[PDB]
Design a protein around this ligand. Sequence first.
Ligand code: G2I
Ligand code: G2I
Ligand code: 9MR
Ligand code: CA
Ligand code: CA
Ligand code: NA
Length: 700
Amino acid sequence: SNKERFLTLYHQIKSDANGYFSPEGIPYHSIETLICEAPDYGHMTTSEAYSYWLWLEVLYGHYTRDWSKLEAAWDNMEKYIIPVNENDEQPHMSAYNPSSPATYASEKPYPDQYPSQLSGARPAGQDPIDGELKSTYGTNETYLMHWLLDVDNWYKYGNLLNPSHKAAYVNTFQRGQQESVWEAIPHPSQDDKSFGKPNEGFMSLFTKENQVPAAQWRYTNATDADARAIQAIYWAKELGYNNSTYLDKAKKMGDFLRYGMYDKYFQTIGSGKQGNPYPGNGKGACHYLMAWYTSWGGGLGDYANWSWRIGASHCHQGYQNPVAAYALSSDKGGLKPSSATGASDWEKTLKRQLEFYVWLQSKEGAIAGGATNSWNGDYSAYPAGRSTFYDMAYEDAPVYHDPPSNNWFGMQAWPMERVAELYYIFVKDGDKTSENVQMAKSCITKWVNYALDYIFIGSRPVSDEEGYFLDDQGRRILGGTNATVATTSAPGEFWLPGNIAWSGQPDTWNGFQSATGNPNLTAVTKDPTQDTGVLGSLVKAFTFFAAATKLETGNYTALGVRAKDAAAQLLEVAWNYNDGVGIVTEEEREDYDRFFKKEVYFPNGWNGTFGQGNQIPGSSTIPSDPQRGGNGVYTSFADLRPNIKQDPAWSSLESKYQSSFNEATGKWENGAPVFTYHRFWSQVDMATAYAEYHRLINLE
Ligand SMILES: OC[C@H]1CNC[C@@H](O)[C@@H]1O[C@@H]1O[C@H](CO)[C@@H](O[C@@H]2O[C@H](CO)[C@@H](O)[C@H](O)[C@H]2O)[C@H](O)[C@H]1O
Ligand SMILES: OC[C@H]1CNC[C@@H](O)[C@@H]1O[C@@H]1O[C@H](CO)[C@@H](O[C@@H]2O[C@H](CO)[C@@H](O)[C@H](O)[C@H]2O)[C@H](O)[C@H]1O
Ligand SMILES: OC[C@H]1CNC[C@@H](O)[C@@H]1O[C@@H]1O[C@H](CO)[C@@H](O)[C@H](O)[C@H]1O
Ligand SMILES: [Ca+2]
Ligand SMILES: [Ca+2]
Ligand code: NA
């Protein structure tokens, strides 16, 4: 019974004996501690994880009719990761100037070139929503999740503005597109300058100004997480939840999530196409997409009565959530905010996001990266011939190049799951005819047919040493439609693609009626693996897709049949990978030499104290690479974080590195480290896949 399967995994996730949650009731990134991927330690948690927790409790609440666990999860979120306090967690937010939201600085192509000068070279444009939010809520305190929490206070900064909370607000990434997770420096969101460099805190690693930096706080959301929370509440409400107390909070979150629709420095959309941006007026700086983040910050202490906000200029397809956008914009969606323009902004976003998906879809069906309003992160002129979407430049790897941000196949499964939900929702709500449903449908239908060529149940694909799939004659499959991957029998196995290698560009967008099929946009799908999180996401994309086809036509379509059977089979084989704690498989991590490599940059002349009490950078360094344009040093991830050497898994990792990694070639000669991880989101993606198959397919 898929219902019983969901219930069993739900209990495994929630059990105090399994360790998914801390003693304060906050879900961790993962049960295991030694892991690094976006958070850099397993007992960090994320806005992402909280968003999945909500989703879990929504489907549990539908089955049990007990909504109290959803409400407790929301309460927990509000207590620990949304910095509003019913002691002020956003001091001086009231002094914000919406006619000068922030002070400009350039992004850089390497971490070595930071700190960046706070020059104000570009005057920031108008913030046109601050006034509405204030009138609507009586405050401009941001009701969004900060993205990262040190749940076990492992970095030892403490929580300045809420000291009795063990979980502390921290941040890592600050230094541009080449600062991988391995290359960042963990620092407190609320910086009283008690750590870092004396008199400066960590601020002077990131920005420079004429003066010593002031004590200050700042937060950054991840727009995909807050939207996924809204998506969860959308379904709560569809499934009968009707406590206005919480419905209203999801609407509030949605209203503030509008900050994600704005250019970083509120520059007019398109205005930097020729390298000469100018400040936005009204909504001129609104791109109506979910960019990578919004940040906010201000002074700490009595002498620092200032605050600021930035949007983001870079938008990734994998972050868009049109289910949230529909929920916040229609009577049928049910979560329209009360602000004057919140719902009508979200309505424009819903359409813009579907146009973005169609624009980005490769010749063979996969979704390419996204677009930016700030080329090179300093409003550089677009390259000659670069394709555009509403005057924003196509990017194959928005925001991060290490690794390229749209290579991970999870970035296909996560957004296409939402688009499949959305197809289902439109058709359920009686819409088969709008331009929006036609876009959603076209994109998900083309994607499903693409994806099925790389999904293997009870068979094992043939791949070569470099991770290319092979056909029956042994040739590499380099994208294209109709991929025919060679296969050997492998009862009980499943395989999914792992990455995409991207080349070319979509054609410039001129609307859905002039779309071209993007014949020069190529996805090469590669690296077969067994990621159970991606599996659970895929299953749902296939489930909702199939269900939609049957609501639309009366029967499962040809492709709907195939998507439904693939879902059923994937659920059936995955069940065998339950270890009693989660549905898991073993993974190799060839990236884990980056625990040891010297690549964490510090500027010359900069010494301070890290949270764990060590002097940083300290003496274990090499000179920075002068080709990267800095003047400083590199330490290692592990020297920066000496407490990682106390982790129970550390000596096995170090021993494996000593015996297998060859520093001169940069290769793992006797195999890479291997781990079996129990990730919270991944387990939720699996549990919800069982549930939704049961609800949409077994019951209807
Ligand atoms: O585990 C959750 C992360 C990975 N999946 C999607 C999101 O839920 C979340 O992403 C992270 O979200 C963080 C918050 O937006 C991103 O960090 C931000 O990256 C921004 C610039 O790249 C920085 O300006 C900002 O200070 C920093 O906080 C980070 O790159 C990005 O990977
Ligand atoms: O080391 C590469 C792969 C080895 N084979 C199995 C794969 O499962 C593994 O891929 C990694 O799989 C991880 C688990 O799905 C991926 O981690 C995820 O990366 C996501 C995107 O940054 C994050 O939002 C999320 O928090 C984080 O857990 C990570 O990117 C991805 O590279
Ligand atoms: O470039 C804008 C912000 C992005 N990253 C960190 C922030 O401190 C930057 O904001 C500026 O901080 C300044 C003082 O430190 C402040 O006086 C400006 O008003 C802020 O934009
Ligand atoms: Ca709070
Ligand atoms: Ca790098
Ligand atoms: Na407190």
